[PDB]
């Protein structure tokens, strides 16, 4: 159906499932926006409820661990329900908890984590159609 990219207002890169790993527990980083078929690990859709899912495996965004990663959607796990609200990717059950990009300290790709809204561009995103 309808897919889209999630672009960071911090580095202009997009949410990307690292190494195109289809396995659950895979970390989500920001990476240069890719075009064509290969962009599958950078494409997402929203289910009926508006909850974000990956086009690669229909997995949801999960913030149970230190950095966000993919996990099969579970309606009973509050940390796996993320929606689009303006320029923020917010937790469905706690709109005060939103995603943010955190650049690497070792020269690697930036990762993502969830914490209190602080108004910086690191917690702002732009939805871009496929």
């Amino acid at each position: 159906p309808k897919f889209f990219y999630i672009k960071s207002e911090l580095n202009g890169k997009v949410l990307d499932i690292g190494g195109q790993n289809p396995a659950p527990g895979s970390k989500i980083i920001t990476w240069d926006q890719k075009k064509g078929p290969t962009a599958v690990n950078q494409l997402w859709y929203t289910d009926q409820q508006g909850v974000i899912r990956s086009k690669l495996n229909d997995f949801a965004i999960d913030a149970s661990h230190e950095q966000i990663e993919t996990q099969p959607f579970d309606p009973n796990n509050p940390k796996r329900a993320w929606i689009v609200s303006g320029n923020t990717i917010a937790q469905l059950s706690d709109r005060d908890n939103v995603l943010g990009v955190i650049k690497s300290d070792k020269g690697a790709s930036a990762h993502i984590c969830a914490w209190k809204q602080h108004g910086g561009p690191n917690q702002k995103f732009i939805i871009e159609s496929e």
Side-chain angles (χ1 to χ4, degrees), residues 46-112:
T46 50
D47 63 28
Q48 263 231 309
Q49 291 64 53
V51 174
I52 301 168
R53 311 290 205 73
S54 169
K55 175 181 185 183
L56 177 66
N57 46 34
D58 310 305
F59 284 172
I61 292 174
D62 171 281
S64 305
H65 295 169
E66 299 200 300
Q67 59 300 289
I68 68 168
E69 39 186 63
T70 58
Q71 293 290 3
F73 179 63
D74 180 0
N76 298 176
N77 193 323
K79 297 177 183 178
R80 294 186 184 175
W82 299 83
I83 66 172
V84 176
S85 186
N87 290 300
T88 80
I89 299 303
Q91 177 167 33
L92 176 67
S93 60
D94 181 2
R95 310 317 187 71
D96 285 319
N97 193 42
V98 308
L99 301 186
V101 177
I102 298 182
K103 297 179 61 180
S104 176
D105 279 341
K106 319 172 304 175
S109 299
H111 63 277
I112 306 291

